[PDB]
Design a protein around this ligand. Structure first.
Ligand SMILES: NC(=O)c1ccc[n+]([C@@H]2O[C@H](COP(=O)([O-])OP(=O)(O)OC[C@H]3O[C@@H](n4cnc5c(N)ncnc54)[C@H](O)[C@@H]3O)[C@@H](O)[C@H]2O)c1
Ligand SMILES: NC(=O)c1ccc[n+]([C@@H]2O[C@H](COP(=O)([O-])OP(=O)(O)OC[C@H]3O[C@@H](n4cnc5c(N)ncnc54)[C@H](O)[C@@H]3O)[C@@H](O)[C@H]2O)c1
Ligand SMILES: Nc1nccc2c1ncn2[C@@H]1C=C(CO)[C@@H](O)[C@H]1O
Ligand SMILES: Nc1nccc2c1ncn2[C@@H]1C=C(CO)[C@@H](O)[C@H]1O
Lengths: 427, 427
């Protein structure tokens, strides 16, 4: 009874894909092997708000195998994989999540993780986008006092933590998992380099070769999106407000342009800025017939979807829609502006989510155990753990690490076992 | 009389290439436009130890145009462009540098910059690899007291600064220019992606397509080298001691291997580690006939060249040599293990050196003006100047920056004019 999923009968399928996914997520299995006996999360009560995919299943069960009790919701109304949710619910784990939630239901699902039977309350939060963090701070401040800290998955959620802390609003420790090197430089980038393409294809089956595709933003996500579409023969355009990131794109042979200038020339538009209304009404009115528009950043407000309620909306299939302009021209909007990789496909593949999620588990162990050593600010995990995360993934893909001799360790000033780079190294 | 170059009659050619190079180095010209009247380096006496190329010419004359007086040497015995040296000497600027120096001459050239006519002594150092910094600290400690600080170009020199500072040996402020974003992420990477290939070609004219090429190290330099050879159809192998960098290479589809395992299989070997004897005698003995071996890191000690004095060395052309093993098999060694892009070609092209060198000038202005605000540690320039450097290069390559609206600036928590990223952002 203590769950809510679309069809519990999907659990056997979800379980079958969880089984394959474990073979793809060596970081998470290595942590079970290391820690399942010593149960370092015994006593941990984790409220989780993070896209309920097959990958998040392997995360949840890793937390459980280390002793934690969890209550889970998704951080996006379209990102859940129903068969994953079911497999977790069937295990007796409270999960509240399904593909196709309304906004009211979304927030109800979050609230469900803050209160469990028998006076269950979380002492930890695991968040992706900052919504759970906001609910707790703004609507359940008595709970705040028993929270040891939050671990946060993504760039947008980290921005929101920093905004809170600047104004004295941050009332618990927070671990920024996004800016683990083995998160930002791998999930954000190599994740989207595969899953952006996947969502576009499942949704529209559009040919990438020969198309003019515009990526807004050239951060870690935009960089992966650009490479993804360039590999398939698209002319790729980039927009940026940061001169350094703009220069990076130019030096990779992308023309750096504004959407103000090029709106009539693009076949495909991908927002990847984590910002607000970078695609406006006049941009879309200017777009050619059947232009495809999608967002991959965390929130749908990258696009002014409100500006389109004016027109008629004709559904094509779930999460793929036409909006018809007065002159009859149509644009294709994916997942109503919600992140297209998780909305129209399945998000990143399991291997790279293992890197991201191995950082999450380690962040949760660190907060549960040593939260008192931390103040109400944003922290990152030390580099030796970052390096550990990468080590655990090398075996799966056949990479053989070279070992430093003593004299080589001294020559560059490191311990043979790491950390191998200064704190400010950018990889 | 106050210079020493190979043939002063090369000055007109050097000048003709300096003229083209200015059109390629908008960062340096923008700084002259901004600063040549106010002469913010008037009174600056700069001792420079940095590869005397056409690019360094435009740097030197930028320093002069801002009021500085300089005395210049190269930081490598093979890296000088003689026609560049001449053009500078003809302008009456003391430069001591030529292609093909002996070690004794090299150190004599450095010393020449520490003492000028009429009791000229530097109050600033500009260094690339740390040699000038070492000479001054270890052999001219009375000079040390009048030095306001050093600006350092490259990863190896920065390692050496950090080693000094750890043991209380650093006795002046130092600006780490390598780890400007517009240095490390552009020169180290996109520079070598062009100039590694250039040196290999000029030296050996070898076909890259179909060859097995091994890059040792996958930092900023190794990353550019890998992409360079992959673009031309080489199977590219990578060796690394850092698990994070190893994982990056695997996720780009490079096999990560040890040279211990693969020495018999490689056609081309590039050392890019900044480390010591990563290529040993037994590796080269194991190498196939006509295997090509080169180093692109700062010092030739990446390769145990000493281990080859045993055998006969047959010259092919300047800086390209055969060493014959007892069984008659031959390996090709480029520039006796010195950095191959500058040793067998011309180093990076002017456009990217403008980014590197615009940081240098700004570092020199900051030390001359505000050195007293600094302690005897290593600093980087603030991000707003990093961003300025990129801004100055956007126009040349046609990149158009998007401007944030007020609400977009607020939404992500930045000023509209920057800095646009937190200090720890890795680009
Ligand atoms: N869908 C996924 O699987 C996934 C994965 C990781 C992150 N994300 C989300 O993607 C978004 C981007 O993340 P990131 O790590 O790349 O962020 P980032 O800060 O590294 O990069 C974003 C870039 O957007 C640029 N930008 C900002 N405003 C702009 C504007 N108005 N026009 C053009 N460019 C602009 C910035 O200069 C910056 O370089 C965030 O919302 C993040 O949470 C999604
Ligand atoms: N020739 C040029 O134009 C040019 C340009 C920039 C820098 N450099 C020189 O290149 C070298 C590398 O610079 P960088 O910025 O790439 O440094 P970096 O620290 O960014 O990368 C070097 C890499 O070498 C790896 N490494 C260290 N020891 C190793 C070993 N024994 N086996 C395998 N891998 C090993 C490290 O893990 C690291 O990732 C330095 O000497 C630097 O000064 C030359
Ligand atoms: N398959 C998958 N399962 C679970 C979570 C996933 C995912 N694919 C991307 N994600 C996150 C969402 C993004 C933005 O919210 C990133 O931060 C990334 O860490
Ligand atoms: N054409 C050129 N002129 C002048 C200097 C150049 C160069 N090409 C690479 N360099 C440097 C040497 C390397 C290592 O010493 C890097 O740090 C780079 O900044």
């Amino acid at each position: 009874q203590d769950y809510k999923v679309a069809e519990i009968s999907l659990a056997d399928w979800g379980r079958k894909e969880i089984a394959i996914a474990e073979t793809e997520m060596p970081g998470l299995m290595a942590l079970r092997e290391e820690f399942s006996a010593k149960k370092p999360l015994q006593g941990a009560r984790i409220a989780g708000c993070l896209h309920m995919t097959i990958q998040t299943a392997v995360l949840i069960e890793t937390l459980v195998a280390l002793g934690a009790e969890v209550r889970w919701s998704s951080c996006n109304i379209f990102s859940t994989q129903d068969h994953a949710a079911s497999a977790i619910a069937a295990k007796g784990i409270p999960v509240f999540a399904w593909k196709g939630e309304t906004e009211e239901e979304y927030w109800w699902c979050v609230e469900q993780t803050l209160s469990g039977p028998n006076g269950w309350t979380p002492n930890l939060l695991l968040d992706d986008g900052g919504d759970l963090t906001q609910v707790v701070h703004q609507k359940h401040p008595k709970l705040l006092t028993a929270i040891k800290g939050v671990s946060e998955e993504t760039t947008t959620g980290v921005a929101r933590l920093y905004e809170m802390a600047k104004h004295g609003q941050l009332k618990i420790p927070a671990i920024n998992v996004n800016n683990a090197v083995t998160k930002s430089k791998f999930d954000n980038l190599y994740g989207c380099r595969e899953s952006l393409l996947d969502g576009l294809k499942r949704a529209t089956d559009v040919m990438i070769a020969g198309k003019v595709a515009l990526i807004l933003g050239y951060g870690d996500v935009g960089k992966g999106c650009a490479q993804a579409l360039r590999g398939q023969g698209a002319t790729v355009l980039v927009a940026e407000i940061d001169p350094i990131c703009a220069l990076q794109a130019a030096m990779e042979g992308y023309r750096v342009v504004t959407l103000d200038d090029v709106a009539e020339q693009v076949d495909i538009v991908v927002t990847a800025t984590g910002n607000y209304h970078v695609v406006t009404h006049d941009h879309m009115k200017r777009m050619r017939n059947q232009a495809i528009l999608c967002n991959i950043g965390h929130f749908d407000s990258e696009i002014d979807i409100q500006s389109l309620k004016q027109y008629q909306w004709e559904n094509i299939k779930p999460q793929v829609d036409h909006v018809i302009f007065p002159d009859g021209k149509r644009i294709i909007i994916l997942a109503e502006g919600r992140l297209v990789n998780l909305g129209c496909a399945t998000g990143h593949p399991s291997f790279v989510m293992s890197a991201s999620f191995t950082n999450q588990v380690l962040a949760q162990i660190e907060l549960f155990q040593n939260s008192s050593q931390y103040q109400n600010q944003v922290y990152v995990l030390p580099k030796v753990l970052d390096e550990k995360v990468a080590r655990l993934h090398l075996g799966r893909i056949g990479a053989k690490l070279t070992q430093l001799s003593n004299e080589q360790a001294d020559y560059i000033g490191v311990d043979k076992n790491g950390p191998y780079k200064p704190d400010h190294y950018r990889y």
